[PDB]
Amino acid sequence: GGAGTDFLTEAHLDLPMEFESIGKAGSRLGTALAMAVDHEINMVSLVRNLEEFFARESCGWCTPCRDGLPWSVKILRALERGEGQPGDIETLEQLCRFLGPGKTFCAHAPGAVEPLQSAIKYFREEFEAGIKQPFSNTHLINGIQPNLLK
Amino acid sequence: MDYTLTRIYPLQKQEIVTDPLEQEVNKNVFMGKLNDMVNWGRKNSIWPYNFGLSCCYVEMVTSFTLRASPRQADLMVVAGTCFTKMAPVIQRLYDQMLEPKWVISMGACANSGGMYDIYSVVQGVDKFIPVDVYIPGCPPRPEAYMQALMLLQESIGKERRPLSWVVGDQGVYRANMQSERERKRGERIAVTNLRTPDEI
Numbered sequence: 001g002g003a004g005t006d007f008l009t010e011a012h013l014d015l016p017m018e019f020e021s022i023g024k025a026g027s028r029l030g031t032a033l034a035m036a037v038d039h040e041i042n043m044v045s046l047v048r049n050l051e052e053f054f055a056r057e058s059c060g061w062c063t064p065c066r067d068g069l070p071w072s073v074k075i076l077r078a079l080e081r082g083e084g085q086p087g088d089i090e091t092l093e094q095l096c097r098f099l100g101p102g103k104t105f106c107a108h109a110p111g112a113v114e115p116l117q118s119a120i121k122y123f124r125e126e127f128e129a130g131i132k133q134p135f136s137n138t139h140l141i142n143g144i145q146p147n148l149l150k
Numbered sequence: 151m152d153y154t155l156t157r158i159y160p161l162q163k164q165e166i167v168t169d170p171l172e173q174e175v176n177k178n179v180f181m182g183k184l185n186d187m188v189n190w191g192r193k194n195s196i197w198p199y200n201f202g203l204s205c206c207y208v209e210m211v212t213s214f215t216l217r218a219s220p221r222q223a224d225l226m227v228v229a230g231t232c233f234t235k236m237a238p239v240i241q242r243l244y245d246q247m248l249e250p251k252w253v254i255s256m257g258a259c260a261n262s263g264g265m266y267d268i269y270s271v272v273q274g275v276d277k278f279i280p281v282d283v284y285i286p287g288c289p290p291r292p293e294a295y296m297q298a299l300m301l302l303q304e305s306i307g308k309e310r311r312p313l314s315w316v317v318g319d320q321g322v323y324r325a326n327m328q329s330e331r332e333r334k335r336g337e338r339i340a341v342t343n344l345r346t347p348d349e350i
């Protein structure tokens with residue numbers, strides 16, 4: 001029931017549309033207005049769209065929601081462009097836990113990570129195909145030998 | 151070339167003067183030849199007395215690769231920290247030397263106290279002993295002392311000390327030489343690229 005609800009699979013279609021049933025399933029009833037995703041839809045691009053909305057609808061009051069959601073959008077865009085680097089899914093999961101209930105000032109972000117955590121839970125393979133490049137945030141400064149962390 | 155007259159240490163006669171020899175009243179070609187001969191013998195016969203202090207003495211012995219008496223020495227190299235308990239000793243040894251005498255300060259400590267601005271250290275030997283050449287470094291490379299000796303030779307070849315203690319002016323005229331820093335400013339500033347600190 002909404003863009004801020006956790007995705008469920010075909011197995012959860014036999015669950016009654018009640019607040020307790022969907023909650024135990026691992027999501028929320030929300031507005032009870034469900035949306036169906038077909039096999040021709042990529043989960044990474046779908047969640048990227050969801051995050052782009054949740055990220056720009058932020059009011060900018062608390063850091064977790066104001067600076068954390070924009071990070072996820074960039075990771076998801078990199079994954080859908082095949083430019084993902086190792087550690088991206090872990091950051092996404094850490095964001096989902098640290099933008100959860102209680103951490104943010106209101107429930108915009110707690111509900112914004114609900115679709116993301118679910119997509120990684122049931123369709124991780126789609127998020128993994130994105131990581132195709134080695135991790136690198138540093139260029140090579142000439143004259144300075146780099147600290148080779150192993 | 152201007153000269154500094156030390157007629158007859160922290161406070162003493164230091165009048166800036168003109169080449170006493172060039173002055174016509176005391177201008178004699180023979181006297182000039184005599185001055186040059188004495189300066190030549192002194193600059194080419196600088197016997198040293200290395201007062202070993204702290205770690206600089208170790209670099210000095212590497213350069214060495216002896217006037218054990220201050221009496222036979224013409225140069226006292228202060229190489230080390232001027233500790234409070236050592237300062238009286240340094241002054242006594244320098245005061246047991248005969249004219250002409252020179253002093254080269256080797257090391258940041260002997261130069262100004264260096265990294266040891268502490269209660270037990272004199273901030274520079276130039277606080278009690280007149281110095282002629284200062285060698286920056288900690289410790290200064292053995293080759294740096296050799297450069298200092300060559301700089302002293304040049305300064306000694308331009309001095310106008312009394313030719314005899316019974317006649318003439320008994321004044322030590324030391325030339326106001328050009329600072330080495332300004333002399334080699336051009337080449338230093340021209341430097342553009344250097345080897346990356348990545349290779350041996």
Ligand code: SF4
Pocket residue numbers: 057058059060061062063065066104105106107108109110
């Ligand atoms: S979680 Fe709520 S209060 Fe915090 S930035 Fe988002 S909209 Fe603003």
Ligand code: SF4
Pocket residue numbers: 203204205206229230231256257258259260264287288289290
């Ligand atoms: S200047 Fe440096 S190396 Fe030389 S004696 Fe002092 S501390 Fe030691």
